[model samples]
Target chain A: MKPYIRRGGRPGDETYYLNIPRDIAKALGITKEDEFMLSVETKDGEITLCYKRVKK
Target chain B: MKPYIRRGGRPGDETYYLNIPRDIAKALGITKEDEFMLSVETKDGEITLCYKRVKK
Candidate 1:
């Protein structure tokens, strides 16, 4: 599923927030306590960000 | 610089760990406490995963 994202903070410290779908997160067993690797697939102008759960 | 990645864990629970360069991380002010969004740029079959620091 496509996640939602927002821009925050400022300049060098600008922050980003990406919201993952609850169902997808549950299915992947990913949680806020977890970190994941993200990859973007650019389809023309549309974009797809895929993530994989990873443990330190 | 490209990060180092290693594959681990079991099926359905496979995990990924991407090691970032200290200088880059510090420059970006990103840390273990940070979560980032990634995008993959495909070039001549070669791959590049770009990330932006995001705060949940």
Candidate 2:
């Protein structure tokens, strides 16, 4: 399931949103309020986003 | 650069990759491709993804 990035409401609002599919979230046992963390790594022209469930 | 989620190209290759620098991308007006589209609402468990570019 490919996901794209989107702009937020109102002008000049730089907020972007991404949604996780129900089946994918369910398989991962993710809940609506579950805490997740995002990280990044870079090598030359490449950049990567790293997402993970924050351990309690 | 808070991005986290990695696993792919091994025994079972379900590759997932996302890497974009907010600051740099914004300054350069760069996108992964020429278009992007992702929408999320309550109707579909708020699922969103990359498919095409949309306008308002």
Candidate 3:
């Protein structure tokens, strides 16, 4: 299995970010959290993606 | 033709971002500055997109 990095999980942390591959975002049709999908695919391969929503 | 806005061009400016439509990014095959297109379209409609690279 491949490893996908998440933005933040430390307690008291309140920031969000992603290190998504450029091509992956293109093929999967996701631009932001609102368009985020549970998983995605591309010509290169496939992978799963999710977001951890935290209260502001 | 519809107007296409650029990201950053102000003198001494060095930061920029876009509010791209999620569907558009997916349909047009773009995810980053390296993948951005001059124009994009989807079931919703069409729009022009471009980016400005500012010096760090």
Instruction: List DockQ, one per candidate, in order.
Output: 0.06, 0.07, 0.04
State each model's C-alpha RMSD to the native: 11.0, 13.1, 13.9
Give the 10-residue window scoring lowest on summed lDDT in candidate 1 chain B: B1-10
Task: Report the candidate with higher TM-score, 2 versus 3.
Answer: 2
- Which scores better on TM-score, 1 or 3? 1
Q: Model 2: per-residue lDDT, tens digit, A1-56? A: 22344466876545333435445544554433444445433323344333454532
Model 3 scores a TM of 0.22
Candidate 3: tens digits of C-alpha lDDT, residues B1-56: 11112225765232212333345334433322322112122221322121211111
Best by lDDT: 1
Quick one: best TM-score, which candidate?
2
> What are the per-residue Cα lDDT tens digits for candidate 3 across A11-56?
4222212233434334433333322112222222322122211211
What is the descending DockQ order?
2, 1, 3
Ranking by lDDT: 1, 2, 3
Interface RMSD of each: 10.5, 11.1, 13.8
Q: How far does residue B16 in candidate 1 sit from its true spot (Å)?
A: 0.8
Question: CAPRI verdict on model 1?
Answer: incorrect
TM-score result, candidate 1: 0.35
Compose the digit string of candidate 1's lDDT tens values, residues B29-54.
54345555554444444443344444
